[PDB]
Design a protein around this nucleic acid. Structure first.
Lengths: 71, 171, 378, 146, 190, 97, 73
RNA sequence: CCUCCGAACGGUAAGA
């Protein structure tokens, strides 16, 4: 249980990479509706890795037990 | 004072300049390739006499049927570290692909021996160039030698002659 | 005067012959290299959360070594032995040098299938650059082989022993984004597997480079698990990396020791396997103690684990932990500048210098001066 | 509709008006970090501790004291400009373990400076520089006639 | 509890983008790498695996799957300097420069790849698709000239050149080279 | 501190005011082997520098509508050209607009 | 001609225009003009640091707008 | 031509 709950709340590589931000490399302001929203090294061609990051399956949104039984 | 001439470092303007330069160079290369790709005809006449041509071609083809590379390579080990008569295998040192550096040969066993010796000295070292103690921090030095022509490294004879000369001076 | 917030330095005052250039060079070197200044700069960096071009990849260390033993398929790509040469210094003269064939390791710990790719010397004919070609050739063969197995046998994550291979692998597997290419903190002894005389006798006398398949879990999987076989293999390979000859004798506890040509390791029983593993562990610890001047009985459990798996970190003299009481009377000023005499006990300007001009140091140097009168250079 | 506005020229001309990277970074602690160049650096919008504490069942008073780390880091980054005695005219106050003068009570910066000079770092820097100068004068005492 | 957002949100935000290289001329005002060496998979312990070749996956499937575009560009540059007779290295470099929306640089790089590695197939018929129009026709003509004239590039020429007035000539020049292809005979017959 | 883009560490706010940068702010210095050298952008008897106003960098609505009509008129002809040549718009025909 | 605020927190807060080439003596003379205390009876401090009369204002880096604490002798 | 030059506080480390 502790391992599963730590993996769910753990800082995934894609979420780790959005935390960062390049120094002096100014990003274009995507997402009009809220400026300041910026992905980190996700696609900014900064200092990340060559391949695209993959979504962690443990972060996939799921529904409750009572909600499922009502469904 | 009277502050001197300073160019404003603008990263965005720098990237825009590089993009314009790249576009202009690509256009130049495109037009050069177009000049090159013009002098070659792009035919990559009739129908029935073409079949007659094919028959003649069939007749025609029927008738036709009837140690030197290791010069200059650097070894990141002391020459004395090699025992006499023992065949040692040197591996290539790990280097980043996006790093232009001369290729270096290295034996893993000699490396871990040297690391162990360095740690032994570091424990033994319980606490001249100007501030020589920062030479390790400033410049970052393993002993190295370069293979000569034919892959042969003959440098121990010179050191032996130096030792003999020093002993003769002592005598 | 030193400006710490801007890392500037200057000096005003009287100068005597040879002092100005000396202080110029000394201060240039001090500002660039200083334990305390480095500590200050690192502390500012940590406070600001400003890092330098090192977004860390996934990293196999000694702490997450347990997760290496899951049910998914792992590979252990290794190019340490791609470009191999041999030298020996004949005591009469020069250094002979002969390039040999190289090898590419694609070892799989779950099933034991060691994929080997041999490299003939002919490929290194007119190459001004050896390392880059080795990396890219190894990555090319990695992606070539990864496409031959079906989806149920392809790796879930690939681990490379050498950190310089991270970039090429992430390029040759662009079409394959699911395999997580991972680094390795701990030096896995996979270059020592060529020290087995079967691999050497094959590669050293081989041409026309061709792929070949092996299996390092010869008959172990019939009686032991997968990550027990991997741990046994790691112990054996670390030993062969350590001596390769003492462990050769240990690998034959008898004179029969039926190591049939059908496989590579001697056909031995598990109960004797425990004993030979104990001897092998003792050999590795004894060699570590011999090389590092440590006591094998003094090693802790995690110390032995780190010894077997990878390596250990050292500690240079430049690494400073600047992070009884002797009272001292000093002529100081108070806050208002009243020229008082104080007696302090805080040990913060008490480091004695004692260099080259002290009576004690001079006398210590004068000791053994009689032994310095041998080589009388007239 | 698409993004009907582009702000690349605005940012470019803003950096030009502020003097570029050189003109901007001297209002900051960048030179105190002693990075060789600004090219390859990157930020961390949250630290490991601050990220791990973002969901740990904290009280409201604990969370209120945890949403101040970004402000403290911003104040420390621009500290060579906010704490200037040109801005914030008034008397200066010295932190009693360092040579830092505080031109105004800037509580989000006094703490970041107390953390940086913990364990008597100012005195240790002075001692280290004194000892390094003693060594360099010792290696040069025959030519220097000392 | 707080339970941060799923990673799918970041993935979809970064997926919004990498728009496209072309648009179907129907939308109105409102509407990669090598696979060049395989090896057959199957006592004694030595197993030479017979290695074969399929030499590429021509159709462009991967797209926008690149992070750190300039790092990938540098890496592929290094590949092409170190292994310049590697056709899919040039193929991947051209496709990467094409993905970003830098068509002309990709065209120049595939031209240099055709020049440098001409004894291949897929480099030529990907340079044909990167190069537009008459330039593509000239590239196909060069490929026909040098590559030993028993290939599929002839059907590419017949498809891309013109109507039957020139398609007939293209098919005739194809069948004149190695007159044994069933596909060429079928194309010429109709 | 307010108008520096967040990547460089500032707040990165946009300005519709008339904020002035004093000449004392656009000067700096660096340490080299030969001592300290002083630099500044606003060197001479110049006009007081304003941080750029946001208005000049938004295209007005009338100009944008006229440009929209012209751009889509060009796109229609380019699409007709694409149809007549059995090709798709390769992002280079639509690069100027 | 820079402008320095010389403040006594009890109350003497004064504003003095002065040159950068001015020594602390000239600045003390101007403060004397604007406060009434004799110039040789004025001390200019920076929290404990006493500015000395023979040093120019440029050397002390007393810039335009800086506050100097006013004490008396 | 433009001459209106303001101030104090919100700036206490807590201890021994």
């Amino acid at each position: 249980r502790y391992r599963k709950m730590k993996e769910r709340l753990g800082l995934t590589e894609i979420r780790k990479q959005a935390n960062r931000m390049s120094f002096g490399e100014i990003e274009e302001d995507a997402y009009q509706e809220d400026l300041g929203f910026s992905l980190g090294h996700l696609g900014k061609s900064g200092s990340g890795r060559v391949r695209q990051t993959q979504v962690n399956e443990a972060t996939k949104a799921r529904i409750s037990k009572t909600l499922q039984r009502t469904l | 004072e009277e502050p001197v001439t300073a160019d404003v470092i603008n990263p965005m303007a720098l990237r825009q300049r590089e993009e314009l330069r790249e576009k202009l160079a690509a256009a130049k290369e495109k037009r050069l390739l177009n000049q090159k790709l013009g002098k070659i005809k792009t035919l990559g006449d009739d129908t029935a006499a073409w079949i007659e041509r094919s028959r003649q071609l069939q007749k025609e083809k029927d008738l036709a049927e009837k140690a030197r590379d290791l010069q200059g390579l650097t070894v990141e080990h002391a020459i004395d570290s090699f025992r006499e008569g023992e065949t040692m295998i040197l591996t290539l040192k790990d280097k980043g692909v996006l790093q232009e550096e001369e290729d270096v040969l290295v034996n893993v066993n000699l490396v871990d021996k040297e690391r162990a010796e360095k740690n032994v000295e570091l424990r033994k070292k319980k606490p001249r160039s100007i501030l020589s103690k920062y030479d390790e921090e400033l410049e970052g030095r393993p002993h190295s030698f370069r293979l000569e022509q034919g892959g042969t490294a003959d440098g121990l004879r010179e050191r032996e002659l130096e030792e003999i000369r020093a002993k003769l001076r002592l005598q | 005067a030193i400006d710490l917030a801007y890392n500037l330095h200057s000096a005003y005052g009287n100068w005597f012959p040879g002092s100005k250039p000396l202080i110029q060079q000394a201060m240039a070197k001090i500002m660039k290299a200083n334990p305390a200044l480095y500590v200050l700069r690192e502390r500012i960096r940590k406070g600001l959360q400003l890092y330098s071009s090192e977004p860390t990849e996934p990293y196999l260390s000694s702490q997450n070594y347990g997760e290496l033993f899951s049910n998914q398929i792992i590979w252990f790509v290794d190019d340490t032995n791609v470009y191999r040469v041999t030298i020996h210094k004949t005591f009469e003269g020069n250094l002979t040098t002969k390039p040999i064939n190289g090898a590419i390791f694609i070892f799989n710990p779950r099933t034991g299938q060691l994929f080997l790719k041999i490299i003939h010397t002919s490929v290194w004919a007119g190459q001004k650059r050896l390392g880059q070609l080795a990396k890219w050739k190894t990555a090319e063969e990695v992606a070539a082989l990864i496409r031959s197995l079906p989806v149920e046998e392809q790796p879930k994550q690939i681990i490379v022993t050498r950190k310089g291979m991270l970039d090429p692998l992430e390029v040759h597997l662009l079409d394959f984004p699911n395999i997580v290419i991972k680094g390795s903190e701990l030096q896995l002894p996979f270059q020592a597997c060529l020290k087995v005389e079967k691999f050497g006798d094959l590669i050293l006398k081989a041409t026309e480079p061709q792929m070949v398949l092996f299996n390092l879990y010869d008959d172990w999987l019939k009686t032991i698990s997968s990550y027990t076989a991997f741990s046994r293999l790691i112990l054996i390979l670390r030993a062969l990396h350590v001596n390769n000859d003492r462990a050769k004798v240990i690998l034959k506890p008898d004179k029969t020791t039926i190591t049939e040509p059908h496989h590579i390791w001697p056909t031995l029983t598990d109960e004797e396997w425990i004993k030979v593993e104990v001897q092998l562990k003792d050999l590795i610890l004894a060699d570590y103690g011999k090389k590092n001047n440590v006591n094998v009985a003094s090693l802790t459990q995690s110390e032995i684990r780190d010894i077997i798996l990878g390596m250990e970190i050292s500690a240079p003299s430049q690494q400073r932990q600047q992070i009884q009481l002797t009272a001292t009377q000093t002529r100081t000023v108070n806050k208002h500048g009243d020229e008082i005499i104080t007696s302090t006990t805080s040990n913060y300007e008490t480091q004695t210098f004692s260099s080259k001009t002290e009576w004690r140091v001079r006398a210590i140097s004068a000791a053994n001066l009689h032994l310095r009168t041998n080589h009388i250079y007239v | 509709d698409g993004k009907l506005w582009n702000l690349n020229n605005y940012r470019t001309d803003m950096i030009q008006a502020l003097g570029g990277v050189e003109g901007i970074l001297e209002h900051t602690l960048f030179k105190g970090t002693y990075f060789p160049t600004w090219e390859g650096l990157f930020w961390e919008k949250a630290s490991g501790f601050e990220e791990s504490m973002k969901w740990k069942k904290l009280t409201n008073a604990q969370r209120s004291g945890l949403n101040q780390i970004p402000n403290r880091r911003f104040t420390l980054w621009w500290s060579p400009t906010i704490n200037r005695a040109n801005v914030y005219v008034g008397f200066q106050v010295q932190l009693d373990l360092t040579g830092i003068f505080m031109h105004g009570k800037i509580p989000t910066l006094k703490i970041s400076l107390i953390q940086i000079f913990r364990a008597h770092l100012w005195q240790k820097i002075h001692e280290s520089i004194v000892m390094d100068l003693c060594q360099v004068f010792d290696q040069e005492l025959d030519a220097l006639e000392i | 509890k707080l339970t941060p957002v799923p990673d799918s949100f970041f993935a979809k935000h970064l997926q919004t983008g990498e728009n496209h290289t072309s648009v179907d001329p129907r939308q109105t005002q409102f509407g990669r790498n090598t696979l060049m060496d395989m090896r057959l998979s199957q006592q004694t312990v030595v197993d030479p695996k017979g290695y074969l070749t399929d030499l590429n996956s021509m159709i462009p499937t991967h797209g926008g799957d690149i992070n750190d575009i300039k790092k990938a560009r540098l890496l592929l540059k290094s590949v092409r300097e170190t292994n310049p007779h590697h056709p899919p290295a040039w193929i991947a470099s051209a496709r990467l420069e094409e993905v970003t929306g830098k068509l002309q640089v990709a065209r120049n790089l595939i031209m240099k790849g055709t020049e440098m590695c001409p004894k291949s197939e897929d480099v030529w018929l990907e340079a044909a698709r990167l190069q537009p129009g008459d330039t593509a026709k000239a590239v196909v003509a060069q490929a026909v000239r040098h590559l030993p004239q028993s290939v599929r590039i002839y059907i590419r020429a017949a498809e891309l050149e013109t109507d039957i007035r020139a398609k007939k000539r293209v098919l005739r020049k194809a069948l004149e080279h190695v007159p044994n292809s069933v596909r060429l005979w079928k194309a010429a017959v109709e | 501190v307010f108008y520096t883009p967040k990547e460089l560490g500032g707040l990165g706010m946009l300005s519709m005011g008339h904020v002035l940068i004093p000449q004392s702010d656009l000067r700096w210095s660096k340490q080299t082997d030969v001592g300290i050298t002083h630099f500044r952008s606003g060197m001479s008897h110049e006009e007081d520098q304003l941080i750029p106003n946001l208005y000049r960098y938004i295209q007005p609505w009338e100009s944008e509508f006229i440009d929209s009509q012209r751009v889509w008129a060009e796109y229609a002809l380019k699409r007709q050209e694409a149809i007549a040549q059995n090709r798709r718009l390769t992002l280079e025909d639509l690069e100027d607009s | 001609m820079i402008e320095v605020v010389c403040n006594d927190r009890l109350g003497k807060k004064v504003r003095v225009k002065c040159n950068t080439d001015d020594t602390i003596g000239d600045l003390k003379k101007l403060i004397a003009a604007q406060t009434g205390t004799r110039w040789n009876k004025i001390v200019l401090k920076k929290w404990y640091t006493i500015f000395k009369d023979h040093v120019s204002l440029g050397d002390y880096e007393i810039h335009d707008g800086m506050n100097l604490e006013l004490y008396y002798q």
